[PDB]
C-alpha cells in the first residue's frame, strides 16, 4: 500500500474526521489508514479507512475514497450529488474546495476485451439507457458536440509545435481540410435524427466498474462512473462513442501507450445485441411492439449510431491534438489522433458517406 | 404584474428556453411571460411561464421561479439539489452562474401570528425534525455557532460608524463586555447536551410557505424553504431560534421595520406542544416509551432549547450590528440588535443563568 505524503495524510485525516459521522469523529490520527490509489498532480485518489479495531457506531462507512482535484466545479458537484441520490453513482460523503469523499466501491475496471462479452455489452446498454433518462438541471440545447468540435478545431489550427515529429504529424492531420470536413459531418448529422439525452460522453472500459463479488452474476455487475464530461447531447454520440472504444486499448505498456485495431469495432450483429438491450431499458413498452416495428427502430438506430461514431473520431482526434500541445501526461497523443482520423475515413468508406 | 427590465426579460427567456424541456424549447419570445416577484440588487425573484395557448408536451413545468444572484455557491447548489431530490425542497430545473430555475410552489409566507397556531406549530416541528435527520455532505464538526459568533464579535469591536445615533447605540451594546459574555454563554452551552444535526438556522415565518389549497388541511400544509444558512449545528439552536422568532414581526411598515414583543415568546405549554410533535418525527419509536421517560426527555429538551435560545439572541444581535455597518437594506439594524440583547438578558433572568 503506497503511503501518501505526510501533508496529504494529515489533510485526509482531518477531512475524514470532520465530514464522516460516527466513529470517524473520534478517530486517533495514529489509527487512520490511507493508501494511494492513483497519484499525479491532478485528480489524485486515495482509500481511507478506520482501523479494524474500531467499531462502526451507526451506518457510517468504514472505508471511503478521497479524490483530490490538485463554473465547472458547481456543475460537476451538483451532477455527482444528484447521481448519488438516484443510486446511479457512488454516494457523496463530503465536498470541500480541494476534493471530495466518495463511497468506496470494491471493483476493478473492465479491460477492453471485456466490452464484447455479450452479457457485459447488454448491461452497458441498459446502464446507458438508464443514464439517458436522467433529467438533470443543465442546458438541454445540444450545442456540446459541434460547439466543442469547433472550439478544438480553432485551437488545433493555431498550434505551434517545436518538436519535429509533432510538426510533421500536425501538418499531415491538417492537410485533410478540417473546416470542410467538419461541415460535411455537420450536414450528415443534421439529417440523422437522434434524441437529445443526458450523455456520459466517455463510456470506455476505464469508466466501467466490475463489481466485486458480482463477476459471475447474470446482471447488475457493472457501474458506470466518471461522469465529469457528461452533457445533454445526441444519443447517437454516446452509443457510437462506446462502439468506437472497442477499437482502442489504453493499457499498452510501451509508446504510444495504446493499441488500435479497426477490426475490433463491433459487428452489426454485436451492435444489434447492444441495441436490443438499450431499447427496452429506454422505452419500457418497447417489447410490446411488433417484430416489424422493432426491426425498423433497430435498423434506424444502427444507421444513427454508426453515423454518430464519425463524430467520436473527429472530436477525439481533435482533442488528442490539443492534448499533444497542453497535456502533462506521457501518451502518444499525435499517434492517437492519427488513429482516430484513420478510423473516421475508414468508417466513412464503409458507410458510403 | 411588474415587468422586468428588457435585458432581464431576454436573459430569462434564454435560460428558460435552453434549460426547460418540452414546449419551452420552441417557445417564441413574444409569448414568454415573466413578472417580478422580488426586486433589488441581489437575489431577485421572477415567475416565468408558458402562454396559456401553448400545450405541455410531456412533464415540463408550465411555470417556474427564476432566482438571480445579482465555495459557498458549490455548497448551496449541492444542498439545494439534494433537498430537491429528497422531496424536501422545490425541484431544481436549471443551474447557471447567474442564478437558478426552481419549481414554482403556489403559496404565501406565514405571518408571525400564525407561528402559534397549534397545527402550524406542530407541523413546523415535524418539518424541522425531518430536516434534522438529513445526512448531508458537509462538515459535521459543530463549529458553526461559536465560530460565527467569534467572527462577528471581532468585526463588531472594530466598527467605526460615522453617524451619531449608530455610534451611541454601538457604545451601549459593547458596554456589556461581549468577550466575557460570549464565554459565559459558551460555558453554559458546553454543559447543555444537544445533538449535532443538520440545521436550517433560520426557521422564521418568512421561510415557511403555506401551500395554496392546503390552508384548511390538518397536516402537510407547509414547506420550509430558504436553506442557504443551513449547517451542521446543535439541535437546540434551531429549535430555540424558532421560538425566538415568535417575538419578532418583520412586516412593520415604519421605522425600524420590525416589532418586538417579549411576551410573545412561546409559553412552556406551547413549547411542549412543539416538542411533542418534534420528538416522534425525529425518533419514530418515541411513542412507545413510557410516560415517565417521555416526560424526562421533554423536560431535558425544554432546558436545552431555552438555553440555546440565548445563542440565537447573541448571534443575531451581533449579526445585526454587522449589518448596520455593511447592509444596503433599509432596516433598523441597531434597534434590532438592542432588542435581541434585551431579550438575551431577559431570558438569562428567567433561566437563573
Ligand atoms: C474528454 N473525453 C470525454 C474524451 C477524450 C478522449 N477519448 C478517447 C480517449 C480515451 C482514453 C484515453 O486514454 C485513457 C488513459 O490511458 C492512459 C495511458 C497511459 C498513461 C500513462 N502511462 C505512461 C507510461 C506507462 N508506462 C510506464 C508503461 C504507463 C502509463 C495514462 C493514461 C485517450 C483517449 C474519449 C473521451
Ligand atoms: C443569517 N441568519 C440565518 C439570520 C440572521 C438574522 N436573523 C434574525 C432576523 C430575521 C429576519 C430579519 O429581517 C427579515 C426581513 O425583514 C425586512 C424588513 C424590511 C425590509 C425593507 N423595507 C423597508 C421599508 C419598507 N417600507 C417602505 C414600509 C418595506 C420594507 C426588508 C426586510 C432580520 C433579522 C435570523 C437568521
Curated annotation (Swiss-Prot), chains A, B:
Keywords: Acetylation, ATP-binding, Cytoplasm, Disease variant, Epilepsy, Intellectual disability, Kinase, Lipid biosynthesis, Lipid droplet, Lipid metabolism, Nucleotide-binding, Phospholipid biosynthesis, Phospholipid metabolism, Phosphoprotein, Transferase, Tyrosine-protein kinase. This is Choline kinase alpha. Its EC number is 2.7.1.32, 2.7.1.82. It comes from Homo sapiens. Plays a key role in phospholipid biosynthesis by catalyzing the phosphorylation of free choline to phosphocholine, the first step in phosphatidylcholine biosynthesis. Also phosphorylates ethanolamine, thereby contributing to phosphatidylethanolamine biosynthesis. Has higher activity with choline. May contribute to tumor cell growth. Phosphocholine binds at residues 40-42. It is found in: Cytoplasm, Cytosol. GO terms for cellular component: cytoplasm; cytosol; lipid droplet. GO terms for biological process: CDP-choline pathway; cellular response to glucose starvation; lipid droplet disassembly; lipid metabolic process; lipid transport; phosphatidylcholine biosynthetic process; phosphatidylethanolamine biosynthetic process. The modification Phosphoserine is found at residue 175. ATP binds at residues 38-44, 67, 103-109, 204, 226. Belongs to the choline/ethanolamine kinase family. It is linked to Neurodevelopmental disorder with microcephaly, movement abnormalities, and seizures: An autosomal recessive neurodevelopmental disorder characterized by severe global developmental delay, impaired intellectual development, microcephaly, early-onset seizures, and movement abnormalities. Its main location: cytoplasm. Changing residue 175 to A: Abolished phosphorylation by AMPK, preventing localization to lipid droplets and subsequent acetylation by KAT5. Homodimer. Heterodimer with CHKB. Pathway: Phospholipid metabolism; phosphatidylcholine biosynthesis; phosphocholine from choline: step 1/1; Phospholipid metabolism; phosphatidylethanolamine biosynthesis; phosphatidylethanolamine from ethanolamine: step 1/3. Changing residue 62 to W: In NEDMIMS; a functional model in yeast shows reduced choline kinase activity. The keyword Cytoplasm applies. The modification N6-acetyllysine is found at residue 143. It catalyses: choline + ATP = phosphocholine + ADP + H(+); ethanolamine + ATP = phosphoethanolamine + ADP + H(+). Homodimerization or heterodimerization is required for the choline and ethanolamine kinase activities. One of its GO terms (molecular function) is ethanolamine kinase activity.
